[PDB]
Design a protein around this ligand. Structure first.
Ligand SMILES: OC[C@H]1O[C@H](OC[C@H]2O[C@H](OC[C@H]3O[C@H](O[C@]4(CO)O[C@H](CO)[C@@H](O)[C@@H]4O)[C@H](O)[C@@H](O)[C@@H]3O)[C@H](O)[C@@H](O)[C@H]2O)[C@H](O)[C@@H](O)[C@H]1O
Length: 386
């Protein structure tokens, strides 16, 4: 053979094409190395299965805030990257941010954010403005309905799309990420009640997606791809999603300027965003080819390589020498406070799972059962407290 085959386990499905191009560039420069890019459905569950078996892919796209990364890093599943030369290319101290036992196990090239995509053209046309408060967000939705347009595209079949929305609902209601987890995670069993002012505020924010005529027809069974199409064609004026979606929206070739805005707080200047490492790689500690795996990770840290990724993806990067877009970019509003205190880490950093949080979030948008949602939250968080 002479050549060596390593595996990269990808979870960035929106960026598959570009990542395969980068991989092909790496292979052209490293003839003795072949990289197998894996894009399997239910990737998180497949990864969990493979880690338990000890069949860890050479390079793994794992989110560095996840309970998986934390637990697997402690178990010695991943290579210690603390003293790698290429790690100096990571700024914002972003690699050290997700350190486990004060050791780096993941290279977070980019950070994802969450907000509301909006149609700039239609907003200007209808005389609408970006909301700065909850009340203004309520009124914005109502004004759009009154003008005979659909405010939101919601992927009712994909509950994960509203993960960031409800997390920011709690974040803005409490005052931040730590305050949100104090109410939800580190509270007493069955502490979350309907009568709680924080819970009332959460419902108020969630009820923005329940305003009369706020969602598109057949939203209940609509998917992530469907909603991307709906927004891109201009069928809906807004869609709540992460910064991961913009690349897919751009691919649909919209006939308008795209903007984003952060989910506002109760008052002006209380808006927040949520996210962590997006394109974030870890190396197997039991890789048969550690030199090749490190070489693949090193390649991605190069400024001319990340620039190629960034120009398609668009999410904020922590890599040195990468030219980032200005204030005219679609993600400008969502990613204005990237790598600051207003950019809090995913709340499931301190949870055992997140799937059920997605479910209860979307189930409320489907039903409007307030007590049911309160009940769902307690049923989700109680097992973690014991
Ligand atoms: O808020 C959602 C998500 O945000 C961070 O990951 C960034 C990630 O978002 C998108 O992938 C979402 C992904 O969700 C589902 O996949 C699973 C479960 O099947 O969920 C796990 C975490 O996302 C993952 O391990 C599993 O594969 C869903 O089935 C799948 O279709 C979706 O793609 C986006 O597509 C991707 O490019 C990234 O930007 C955060 O780290 C996550 O914990 C989560 O909160």
């Amino acid at each position: 053979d002479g050549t060596v085959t390593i595996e990269y386990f990808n979870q960035k499905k929106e960026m598959t094409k570009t990542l395969e191009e980068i991989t092909r560039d790496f292979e052209k420069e490293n003839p003795k190395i072949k990289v197998k890019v894996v894009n399997v459905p239910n990737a998180g569950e497949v990864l969990k299965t493979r880690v338990l078996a000890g069949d860890v892919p050479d390079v793994v796209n794992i989110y560095p805030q996840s309970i998986e990364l934390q637990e697997w890093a402690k178990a010695g599943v991943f290579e210690d990257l603390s003293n790698k030369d290429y790690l100096k290319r990571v700024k914002n101290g972003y690699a050290e941010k997700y350190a486990v036992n004060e050791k780096v196990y993941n290279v977070p090239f980019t950070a994802n954010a969450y907000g509301i995509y909006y149609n700039k053209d239609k907003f200007e046309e209808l005389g609408l403005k970006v909301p700065e408060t909850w009340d203004e967000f309520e009124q914005l939705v109502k004004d759009i309905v009154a003008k005979g347009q659909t405010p939101f595209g919601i992927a009712g079949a994909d509950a994960w799309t509203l993960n960031g929305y409800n997390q920011l609902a709690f974040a803005t209601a409490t005052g931040g990420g730590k305050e949100a987890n104090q109410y939800l995670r580190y509270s007493q069993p069955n502490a979350i009640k309907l009568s709680d002012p924080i819970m009332k505020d959460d419902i108020k924010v969630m009820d923005i997606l329940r305003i009369n005529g706020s969602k598109q027809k057949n939203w209940e069974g609509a998917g992530y791809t469907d909603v991307i199409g709906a927004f891109a064609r201009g069928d809906v004026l807004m869609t709540p999603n992460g910064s991961w979606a913009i690349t897919a929206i751009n691919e649909q070739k919209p006939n308008f300027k795209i903007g984003t805005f952060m989910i506002p707080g109760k008052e002006k200047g209380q808006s927040l965003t949520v996210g962590a490492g997006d394109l974030a790689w870890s190396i197997s500690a039991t890789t048969k080819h550690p030199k090749e795996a490190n070489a693949f990770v090193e390649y991605m840290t190069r400024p001319e390589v990340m620039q190629k990724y960034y120009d398609v993806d668009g999410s904020p990067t922590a890599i040195e020498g990468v030219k980032q877009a200005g204030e005219d970019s679609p993600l400008a509003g969502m990613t204005e406070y990237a790598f600051t205190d207003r950019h809090l880490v995913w709340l499931q950093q301190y949870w055992t799972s997140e799937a059920d949080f997605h479910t209860l979030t979307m189930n409320y948008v489907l039903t409007g059962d307030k007590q049911g949602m309160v009940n769902d939250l307690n049923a989700f968080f109680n097992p973690m407290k014991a």
